[PDB]
Design a protein around this ligand. Structure first.
Ligand SMILES: COCCOc1cnc2ccc([C@H](C)n3nnc4ccn(-c5cc(C)ns5)c(=O)c43)cc2c1
Length: 287
């Protein structure tokens, strides 16, 4: 680490993000996650806390890497995945240390035959995601890749918006398509009309993605637009089409989704308004 290279004011924060090699025991033997940029393994962190250790070696400016960690550690919210820190290993790229999420990613959880979340439960997961996104949006942070696959659940079934900062990766390559002109691999079925056209992402395009995530929840993890092929989604939507109302999605919740998919970005609801609206719908259910 070169503390001279960093922003002078961020030098203090480094001792809080850096995890000493002796503090962390990473179990490389068993793999719990597969990403494009690297695998993730079981980890034991001295404090004994169970954690997930992500490799990034499958890096760039080290000063930039550390600052990314510092920003990420400053986030603290029950529905946002935290960063426990970064462990530097001599011989290999640095490791990202995240809290262990017992019940995997949200999409696989709702697709699990052995778990039977109620309609209320699924609306509840939707609310938690809206809450985490409200926090992140207030921090002027733009996720760019909000989807059910990219949220995770701890032992208490608490839903945390994940897959951002140093944890950012492609964890299911099927849903990422190569753009023609710029080669970027984009999650086109979660993307807002404008983002498909310009590749510019905003909080308002996160809101569109959140609409699709609500749909995944209500369909219990069904793939959006199966009958559609990659970048043909712009044409499909422009025909005047949206995802259909899932069988058990409450009418008010479908209206929420449609609002999230408003043609005008600025007319989509804020994450605050979504929290409000969804909490009300949630409150009408029992069980
Ligand atoms: C035995 O299965 C238990 C789940 O294993 C874990 C536990 N905690 C984790 C915490 C973070 C992560 C990595 C770094 N991560 N961070 N954000 C995300 C978002 C989605 N995903 C995944 C999505 C999918 C479809 N497979 S993995 C992540 O792995 C992830 C993986 C874990 C895997």
């Amino acid at each position: 680490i070169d503390l001279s290279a960093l922003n002078p004011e961020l030098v203090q924060a480094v001792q809080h993000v850096v995890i000493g090699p002796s503090s962390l025991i990473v179990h490389f033997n068993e793999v719990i996650g597969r990403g494009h940029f690297g695998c993730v393994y079981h980890g034991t962190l001295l404090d004994k806390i169970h954690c997930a250790v992500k490799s990034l070696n499958r890096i760039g400016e080290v000063s930039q890497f550390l600052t990314e960690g510092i920003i990420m550690k400053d986030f603290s919210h029950p529905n946002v995945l935290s960063l426990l820190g970064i462990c530097l290993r001599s011989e290999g790229s640095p490791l990202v240390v995240l809290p262990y999420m017992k019940h995997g990613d949200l999409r696989n959880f709702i697709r699990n035959e052995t778990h039977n979340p109620t309609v209320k439960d699924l609306i509840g997961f939707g609310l938690q995601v809206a809450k985490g996104m409200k926090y992140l949006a207030s921090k002027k942070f733009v996720h760019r890749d909000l989807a059910a696959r990219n949220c995770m659940l701890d032992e208490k079934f608490t839903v945390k918006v994940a897959d951002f900062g140093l944890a950012r990766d492609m964890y299911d390559k099927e849903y990422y398509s190569v753009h023609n002109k710029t080669g970027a691999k984009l999650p086109v079925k979660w993307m807002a009309l404008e983002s498909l056209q310009t590749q510019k992402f905003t909080t308002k395009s996160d809101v569109w993605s959140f609409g699709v995530l609500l749909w995944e929840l209500m369909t219990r993890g069904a793939p959006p637009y199966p009958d559609v092929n990659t970048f043909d989604i712009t044409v499909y939507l422009l025909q005047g089409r949206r995802l259909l109302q899932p069988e058990y999605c409450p009418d008010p919740l479908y209206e929420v989704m449609l609002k999230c998919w408003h043609p005008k970005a600025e007319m989509r609801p804020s994450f605050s308004e979504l929290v409000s609206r969804i909490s009300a719908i949630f409150s009408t259910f029992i069980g």
